[PDB]
């Protein structure tokens, strides 16, 4: 057995190692990385993304979101509320000013230790789900809007041909800003891409102890868990490193900086906070080693989690049992 121990494996492909996208997602899965749930990716010394980030102040946020904590420092729960339109050189402003900037701080160490005792305290707002690529056109490695589709990874191996397309999206954040425990939709893969500015921190479950994080947060959201079998679907819950020492969960962290991808596997629960300003693109996407997770993904029905019409055709093919049900919380 490769990576017996689910540590976070790094990677640094050469310039002909990362000329061929899904020949590399199978290289680091060889060597046990999928393990984990999280690999990173630095890319090799020449390649860039684009030529400078210089022109990105226009960019619309149309609904930026402050994200409102209730709980404990440690196990909460957050919201978002919309706030009006703005566009990334406002919000960068906002980031930067006195009340959302990053505070003074030692090192990763003592970032980390001031966003888990003090996060609750604060509602930053963060731009998420925006619709968009800054990866350069003629970027031909590891361009987020240039990978394969899952409609043609169904296709190709289970020969159904599907409506949808997917595409990547844009995540404008600020210290604070914070990702809660989730997978992706169908269990899918995600990739992420920090284009500029301040680090992530991530945080993430192996894959084969999903469920024992999923029981913890059923212990710890009652009246979320009474409310759907599914509810982490719903990315509002937020479990700290103590908590989950203290739980017997086991995790690994890992902080990405300017330049770096980060994978995310079938699966792995992950979760996280923006050190600051920072720019990243994401996608999910699909190998053939998905499929029999995408088959077993947990479902949200409550109504709540409200996906997106590409999920339709997924739910449709893979799991036809559930797709009724399903289908109706999506109403
Ligand atoms: O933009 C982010 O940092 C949030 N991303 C993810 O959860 C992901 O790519 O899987
Ligand atoms: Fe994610």
Same mark, same amino acid.
């Given at each position: 057995?490769?990576?017996?121990?689910?540590?976070?494996?790094?990677?640094?492909?050469?310039?002909?190692?990362?000329?061929?996208?899904?020949? !590399? +997602?199978?290289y680091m899965e060889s060597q046990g990385a999928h393990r984990?749930?999280?690999?990173? +990716? +630095?890319?090799?010394?020449?390649?860039?993304?684009?030529?400078? #980030?210089?022109?990105?102040?226009?960019?619309?946020?149309?609904?930026? $979101? &402050?994200? =409102?904590?209730?709980?404990?420092?440690?196990?909460?729960? &957050? #919201?978002?509320?919309?706030?009006?339109?703005?566009? =990334?050189?406002? @919000? %960068?402003?906002?980031?930067?000013s006195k009340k959302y900037q990053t505070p003074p701080h030692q090192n990763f160490e003592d970032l980390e230790r001031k966003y888990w005792k003090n996060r609750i305290y604060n509602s930053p707002i963060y731009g998420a789900d925006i619709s968009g690529s800054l990866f350069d056109e003629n970027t031909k490695q590891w361009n987020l809007g240039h990978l394969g589709t899952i409609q043609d990874l169904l296709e190709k191996e289970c020969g159904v041909v599907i409506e949808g397309v997917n595409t990547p999206y844009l995540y404008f954040g600020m210290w604070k800003t914070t990702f809660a425990w989730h997978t992706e939709d169908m269990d899918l893969y995600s990739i992420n891409y920090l284009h500029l500015g301040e680090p992530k921190t991530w945080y993430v479950v192996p894959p084969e102890h999903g469920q024992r994080l999923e029981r913890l947060a059923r212990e710890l959201f009652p009246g979320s868990s009474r409310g759907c079998g599914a509810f982490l679907r719903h990315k509002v819950a937020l +479990?700290?490193?103590?908590?989950?020492?203290?739980?017997?969960?086991?995790?690994?962290?890992?902080? &990405?900086?300017?330049?770096?991808?980060?994978?995310?596997?079938? !699966?792995? !629960?992950?979760?996280? /906070?923006?050190?600051? /300003?920072? *720019?990243?693109?994401?996608?999910?996407?699909?190998?053939? %080693?998905?499929?029999? @997770?995408?088959?077993?993904?947990? &479902?949200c029905s *409550?109504?709540?989690? %409200?996906?997106?019409?590409?999920?339709?055709?997924? =739910? %449709?093919?893979?799991?036809?049992?559930? !797709?009724? $049900?399903?289908?109706?919380?999506?109403?």
């Amino acid at each position: 057995a490769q990576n017996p121990n689910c540590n976070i494996m790094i990677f640094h492909p050469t310039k002909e190692e990362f000329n061929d996208f899904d020949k !590399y +997602i199978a290289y680091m899965e060889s060597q046990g990385a999928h393990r984990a749930g999280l690999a990173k +990716i +630095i890319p090799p010394k020449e390649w860039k993304a684009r030529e400078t #980030y210089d022109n990105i102040s226009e960019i619309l946020i149309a609904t930026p $979101l &402050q994200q =409102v904590a209730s709980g404990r420092a440690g196990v909460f729960t &957050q #919201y978002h509320k919309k706030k009006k339109a703005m566009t =990334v050189g406002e @919000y %960068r402003h906002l980031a930067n000013s006195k009340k959302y900037q990053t505070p003074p701080h030692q090192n990763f160490e003592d970032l980390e230790r001031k966003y888990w005792k003090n996060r609750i305290y604060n509602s930053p707002i963060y731009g998420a789900d925006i619709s968009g690529s800054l990866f350069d056109e003629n970027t031909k490695q590891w361009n987020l809007g240039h990978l394969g589709t899952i409609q043609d990874l169904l296709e190709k191996e289970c020969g159904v041909v599907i409506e949808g397309v997917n595409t990547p999206y844009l995540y404008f954040g600020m210290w604070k800003t914070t990702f809660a425990w989730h997978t992706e939709d169908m269990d899918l893969y995600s990739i992420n891409y920090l284009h500029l500015g301040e680090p992530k921190t991530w945080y993430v479950v192996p894959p084969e102890h999903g469920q024992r994080l999923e029981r913890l947060a059923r212990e710890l959201f009652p009246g979320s868990s009474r409310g759907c079998g599914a509810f982490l679907r719903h990315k509002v819950a937020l +479990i700290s490193p103590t908590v989950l020492k203290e739980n017997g969960i086991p995790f690994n962290r890992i902080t &990405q900086e300017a330049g770096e991808f980060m994978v995310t596997f079938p !699966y792995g !629960y992950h979760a996280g /906070f923006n050190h600051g /300003f920072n *720019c990243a693109e994401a996608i999910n996407f699909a190998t053939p %080693r998905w499929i029999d @997770y995408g088959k077993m993904a947990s &479902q949200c029905s *409550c109504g709540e989690a %409200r996906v997106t019409f590409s999920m339709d055709a997924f =739910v %449709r093919i893979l799991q036809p049992e559930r !797709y009724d $049900l399903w289908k109706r919380g999506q109403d």
